Every structure is written in C-alpha cells, then in structure tokens.
C-alpha cells in the first residue's frame, strides 16, 4: 500500500540474518534449521556452506546471527552466533569466527570463543545478535534462557549485553573485571529476551531492543554498567495476565527506563537505521521488525528518542524477522517462515 516490495528470493526455511558482502557480491544468510547460504542476484541461492558449526536447532534456538568483522577488506573474517547443547540437555549462546574463502564455498578455522554460561535453555531466550561497534568491541546480546531473575544475576551471563574486545577478549575497562563473582563479559543486565541491535549513525551508540513477555517489548539505549530491570521492572504481565512475580512495577529505583516500550507486543524483532540520500523519505528513521504483528514498524529518531509513524508489510500477513540498510539504499527484509522470504523494500 505504502512500500514497494521484491521477492529476491522464496522458500528459505527460517532465516534469521543476512550480511552484505563488498563489491556486489550478494549476501550471507543464516538459516535457523543450521545452514549458512550465499545469494547473489542472477545466481540465486546456493548450496550450504562448509565449515558452519553444528547447532542446537530446537525452540528459538539454531543458527543464529552472521555478521562481517570490521576489517573483513583484509580478514575475510566472518562472526557467527548459534544456540549450543550442554550436559544435561540444556543449552545455551555461543559465538565464535572463521574466515569466508575467497569463492564464497566454505568457512575456514571456525571456532568459539565465547559461550553464555551456564546453559539453561530449554528453547527459549538466548538473544544472538552481534554488533560491531567500529572503535575496537563487539556487543553480544543474551537473553536470560527463560529464567527470569538470572538477568539480575552478575555470576550469570543470563539476560546481559556483553562486550569483548573485537577479538573476543575480556576489555580491561568492562565494569565488572574488578568485581567479585561477576563475570568480567558483563557491559549491561537486567534483559529479557534481546532481539534486535543496531548503531545508531547519528549518536554513534548501540540501541537494542526486547521481547516482553504479555506486553512490554522495549527499545533501550544500553550503558556502561546499568541494570535494564528484568524481572525487576517489566512494562508488561504475564500471559496469565497477572503480574510477573517478581516485578517490583513498571518503574523501579535504580534501574533504566526504556526509551520506547509496547504494552501490546509486536515481538519485535531485527531493527536498521535509515541514513541515506537514496529515500530521502526515510532519512531519520528505523524501521523494526514484528514477528506476532507480521508487519514493519516505521519509527522517527529523534536523538535519543523515538516515535512511531505506522507499519508497513502488514498486508503481506508475513512474521518479520530481520530487517536491514542496504549499501544501496533500499531495506532488505528477512520473514520468520518456513517457507521464508528475502524481500527488498522501497517507499512509493
Ligand atoms: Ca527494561
């Protein structure tokens, strides 16, 4: 009605997150079930790769995200995030690298070098998203595996934004390296279930947002050492439609208030700013993925605030899982299916 749409590419069981390759040589797509593919226009898709590692494909969990380190012209170093099975059949996030071959066939020298410990889910909640943010860290969001008052918890990596350096090392500046029992991976808790991540090209800072459970999906702007809430705060109830039992109530001293919270959940999901000349239109904007509402969500960035236009997608009645900025200037959009979309979208 409002936004051009293009099928790119049909029946892709469950993506969860593409990366761009340089030079117009397409993009990499994970598909949750545990397969990395390529696509390239007048190519289509190809086969998986070689050298993904094995995932714990059940619930919410699998392959996970796929992202290009920031040196990747030289590296060729691609990131990987993927749910992964413990010892008592509970698992949990792990995150690791390898190198992307120069023919785009097979993953090279994977290997792990983070992991959410301990592992507690049973197929909920284990965040995944990986972002770069271009001044020597990466974040990594975790969801606290559907234990809620692990998020409070600093021994626990349940429910945390962590930060590594982008190499994976524990930064000698994290909040917690001098706290007792804390784990020293901790940059901020108190996190539901994170979902989406982004830079934000204006403030040149992370936003992340969450799943609230009946209600309550957040937009945050994390900082160094803060408590986000969970289970503590909580603008939503559970799905009985009583309180969560351990919330304290929606506002709740020493804690950060979200800067955008649903009490009817989109479940949203992967998030892009919009900061380019292409769609002039778009200029200021982010545009949310809504996996329960099937639809996009438009948003006006406002420095640290946010407002929302309206959706777009709606009348597809497709689950929005990921959404993306182009190099090119259009918004690239991956559906939550199984038999998935790759969509490019324009406004009219
Ligand atoms: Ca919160």
Redesign the pocket.
């Known amino acids: 009605a409002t936004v051009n749409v293009e099928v790119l590419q049909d029946k892709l069981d469950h993506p969860w997150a593409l990366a761009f390759l340089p030079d117009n040589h397409g993009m990499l797509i994970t598909l949750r079930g545990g397969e990395l593919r390529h696509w390239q226009a007048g190519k289509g898709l190809s086969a998986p790769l070689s050298g993904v590692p094995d995932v714990w494909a059940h619930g919410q969990g699998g392959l996970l995200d796929v992202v290009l380190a920031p040196d990747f012209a030289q590296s060729r170093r691609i990131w990987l995030s993927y749910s992964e099975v413990g010892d008592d059949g509970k698992a949990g996030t792990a995150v690791g690298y390898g190198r992307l071959s120069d023919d785009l066939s097979k993953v090279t020298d994977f290997r792990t070098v983070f992991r959410q410990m301990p592992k507690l889910s049973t197929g909920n909640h284990f965040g995944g998203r990986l972002v770069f943010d271009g001044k020597g860290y990466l974040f990594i969001a975790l969801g606290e595996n559907n234990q809620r008052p692990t998020a409070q918890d600093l021994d626990k990596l349940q429910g945390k934004l962590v930060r590594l350096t982008d190499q994976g090392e524990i930064p000698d500046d994290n909040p917690f390296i001098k706290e007792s029992g804390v784990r020293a991976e901790i940059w901020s808790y108190?996190?539901?279930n994170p979902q989406g991540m982004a830079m934000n090209p204006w403030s040149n800072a992370l936003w992340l947002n969450?799943h609230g459970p009946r209600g309550?999906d957040?937009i945050?702007i994390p900082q160094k050492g803060k408590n986000?809430?969970?289970p503590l705060?909580?603008?939503g109830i559970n799905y009985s439609g009583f309180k969560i039992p351990e919330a304290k109530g929606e506002i709740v001293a020493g804690?950060?208030?979200?800067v955008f919270?649903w009490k009817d959940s989109p479940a949203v999901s992967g998030m892009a700013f919009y900061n380019s000349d292409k769609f002039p239109q778009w200029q200021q904007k982010l545009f949310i993925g809504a996996l329960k509402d099937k639809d996009v969500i438009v948003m006006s960035v406002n420095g640290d605030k946010v407002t929302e236009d309206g959706r777009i997608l709606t009348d597809r009645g497709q689950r929005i899982r990921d959404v993306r900025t182009g190099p090119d200037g259009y918004l690239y959009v991956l559906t939550d299916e199984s038999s998935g979309e790759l969509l490019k979208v324009s406004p009219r």
């Open positions: 108190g996190i539901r969450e309550g957040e945050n986000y809430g969970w705060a909580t603008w804690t950060e208030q979200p919270y």
